[PDB]
A paper describes a structure:
The sliding clamp PCNA (proliferating cell nuclear antigen) is a central player in multiple aspects of chromosomal DNA replication, repair and genome stability. This ring-shaped homotrimer encircles double-stranded DNA to act as a processivity factor for DNA polymerases and a landing pad for the assembly of various DNA processing factors such DNA ligase I, the flap endonuclease Fen1, and the clamp loader complex replication factor C (RF-C) which opens and closes the PCNA ring around dsDNA. Many of the proteins that interact with PCNA, including DNA polymerase δ, DNA ligase I, Fen1 and RF-C, do so via a common mechanism that involves a short linear interaction motif on the partner protein called a PCNA-interacting protein (PIP) motif. The best characterised PIP motifs have conserved sequence Qxxψxxθθ, where ψ and θ represent amino acids with hydrophobic and aromatic side chains, respectively, but other variations on this sequence (so-called non-canonical PIP motifs) have been identified such as ψxxxθ and Qxxψxθ.
The p50 (PolD2, Pol31) and p66 (PolD3, Pol32) subunits of Pol δ are also found as components of the trans-lesion synthesis DNA polymerase Pol ζ, in complex with the Pol ζ catalytic subunit REV3L (yeast Rev3) and two copies of the accessory subunit REV7 (Rev7). The conserved PIP motif found at the extreme C-terminus of human, S. cerevisiae and S. pombe PolD3 orthologues is readily identifiable at the C-terminal end of the Ct PolD3 protein (sequence: 441 QGSIMSWF 448 conserved PIP motif residues underlined). The Ct PolD3 peptide (sequence: 437GKGGQGSIMSWFAKK451 with conserved PIP motif residues underlined) occupied a single PIP binding site only, with the other sites on Ct PCNA being occluded by crystal packing (specifically, by the loop that spans residues Thr186-Lys190 in neighbouring symmetry mates). Only 11 of 15 residues in the peptide could be seen in the electron density map (Gln441 to Lys451) suggesting that the N-terminal four residues of the peptide are flexible. Consistent with the high degree of conservation of the PIP peptide sequence at the C-terminal end of PolD3 orthologues, the mode of PCNA-PIP binding observed is strictly canonical: part of the peptide adopts a 310 helical structure, Ct PolD3 Gln441 inserts into the Q-pocket on Ct PCNA and Ct PolD3 Ile444 and Phe448 form a 2-fork plug that inserts into the hydrophobic surface pocket on Ct PCNA. Ct PolD3 Gln441(OE1) makes water-mediated hydrogen bonding interactions with Ser208 (N) and Ala252 (O) on Ct PCNA, Gly442 (N) hydrogen bonds with Pro253 (O), Ser 443 (OG) and Ile444 (N) both hydrogen bond with His44(O), Trp447 (NE1) hydrogen bonds with Glu232 (O), Ala449 (O) with Gly127 (N), and Lys451 (N) with His125 (O). Hydrophobic interactions with Ct PCNA are seen with Ct PolD3 Gln441, Gly442, Ile444, Met445, Trp447 and Phe448.
Author numbering:
A (entry chain C): 1 to 94, 96 to 105, 108 to 123, 126 to 164, 166 to 255
B (entry chain P): 441 to 451
C (entry chain A): 1 to 163, 166 to 255
D (entry chain B): 1 to 105, 108 to 125, 132 to 255
């Protein structure tokens, strides 16, 4: 029913590792478009949305909709056994287990992961008030550092983008200004702004989102007054891992 | 174990 | 009133990290010569003495004497936010309430700014006498770290005897010593051991403290150790030019 | 009575580091053949067997048999003070109270007198597998995340490591292969008879703490006997781990 081959297993290992503290149990929904995941955290603050597109596999074959009900801690134990440069193949029949095969050498690793039953979150396309594309490790560094001082960050976007906080030790801010880096494009700061925004967020959650930073050298951060913050990493091509965070009110 | 203040005076 | 720019934040990060386990609270005294620090550890056994000279900055401006009363745990939280290769600027007005720190990314278009709340710290300043020591040892700083760390695994005390130099200790598991001989390494000078001796010395010290002093090993590939009988140990690292970080340690009596 | 010189301290450092989590206290038995160790691990399940042969030293002198009763945590504190490229000399008197260790670099001499303790000395395979030691570490560590036990099956053409747990089943199959471009990556099986045995992973993972000793590990299997996991220490010196199969 399902046969999906990933040239580099690295990506799925990193995704699950990036997600497993926010979401314990979830469904991997498989269809013709590819393999998707949607879940809200235990405390109803954050939403995880992943899409690995069919085109990212070679080959990809899914005979119908298939929900793979997985515990992510369990899946992590299996995925740890894939080397970064392993080829990964997912198989499942119309299922009690997921079959994972990691191929190098001629070495084959094969796991039958026991599935669970989890009950099955369309996010409407929004044109955000502000977008920042920046280096992902830079964003990790900012959130981690500010979190040492405060539980909350205010994010303002205007004529740059400023992350600010206050705490016992004092005040801190990090300002990012529009900048194209011609020699090292991943170091660029790209800001699209249609409208000023000023919102406050939990740092704890943002720092969790930055566990995904090894997936990509760039992160996209989207702000709107109407809707939750979007933090997006590329999984290659137009595949993605998205985190949504409601502002503190 | 001596105190450093036994060797260095105030000021 | 104060505006002091470091091309690389590295040095200040390493200094504070080298000091913060000995010293919780202290004053950074700023004047036209540069930024100094003098503080006893919490137990009044060691003295920390630092001088970052004006010439080490680019530029440096201090219009007036300024005492920055800082908690080093707090300062560490802020300094952790600077990358080693960030440009770091310290600012403060006359009679300041906060220290303003600005970190400018050398790799992207990012400016970090912190207003660190200052505290009121009572001076407790000591005069350090100019001393002609009986013996001076200049050796690789990583070597000194290795010796102190290794001996500390088996004993709380080290005896340092100079005549080469022998570090010895005794403990539950038995005895250990490390003997170093005068040696100039012409092809790899960093490996050299220089001993200047006017008089034999034998003193005993707490290893805990020496191991703390060796947190400063990242600042310099060389350490200077100065000994006299009935006199505190000096462990000195150069911070470039005539800037320095000095540790004084009273002997066990 | 004992005078044993190692050109490079590396080997002894690595051996003790490879052993100290399995074995807290033990005797280093010294005789004409060299320096041996035979001991059960802390939990009395597995057997550790080491031999540093006389020929591996230069020189080696043991005038009479000596047991060096050592706490390995204590010995580790001392050995940490030797750099890998240090010259290491062991000395001890007849019926000794301390072990004398000397590390020579630079112009540095380190000397330790380690206090000895009194420790009681507790009193042909169907298949051999020679594989990269880091590969064996990787497999045991990974499978241990999901299971307490591994089955090792060997035949002409390959070795399969398999395990079962609550989360499901997993296996790693390696084919007999000589790797022409990367010979250390080669898998060699010498086989008189296929074998299938099951072992505790915790212990195998502990054995792989020795993986820095050699780029290859030897795994020896029979139905009649305990598993042997062997690392070469150079020449005919060795560190061997024995583990009974699950019943």
């Amino acid at each position: 029913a399902l046969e999906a081959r990933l040239e580099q297993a690295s990506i799925l290992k990193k995704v699950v590792d990036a997600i497993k503290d926010l979401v314990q149990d979830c469904n991997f929904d498989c269809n013709d478009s590819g393999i998707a995941l949607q879940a809200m955290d235990n405390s109803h603050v954050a939403l995880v949305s992943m899409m690995l597109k069919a085109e990212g596999f070679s080959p990809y074959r899914c005979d119908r909709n298939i929900a793979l009900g997985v515990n992510l801690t369990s899946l992590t134990k299996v995925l740890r056994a894939a080397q970064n440069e392993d080829i990964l193949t997912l198989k499942a029949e119309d299922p009690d287990v997921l079959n994972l095969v990691f191929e190098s050498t001629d070495r084959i690793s094969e796991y039958d992961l026991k599935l669970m039953d989890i009950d099955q979150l369309g996010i409407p396309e929004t044109e955000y008030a502000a977008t920042i594309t920046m280096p992902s490790n830079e964003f990790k560094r900012i959130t981690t550092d500010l979190m040492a001082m405060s539980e909350s960050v205010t994010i303002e976007a205007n004529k740059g983008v400023k992350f600010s906080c206050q705490g016992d030790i004092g005040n801190g801010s990090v300002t990012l200004r529009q900048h194209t880096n011609v020699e090292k494009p991943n170091e660029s700061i790209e800001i699209e702004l249609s409208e000023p925004v000023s919102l406050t967020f939990s740092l704890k959650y943002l720092v969790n989102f930055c566990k995904a930073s090894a997936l990509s050298n760039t992160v996209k951060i989207c702000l709107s007054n109407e809707v939750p913050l979007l933090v997006e990493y590329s999984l290659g091509g137009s595949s993605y891992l998205r985190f949504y965070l409601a502002p503190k009110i | 174990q001596g105190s450093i203040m036994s060797w260095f005076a105030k000021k």
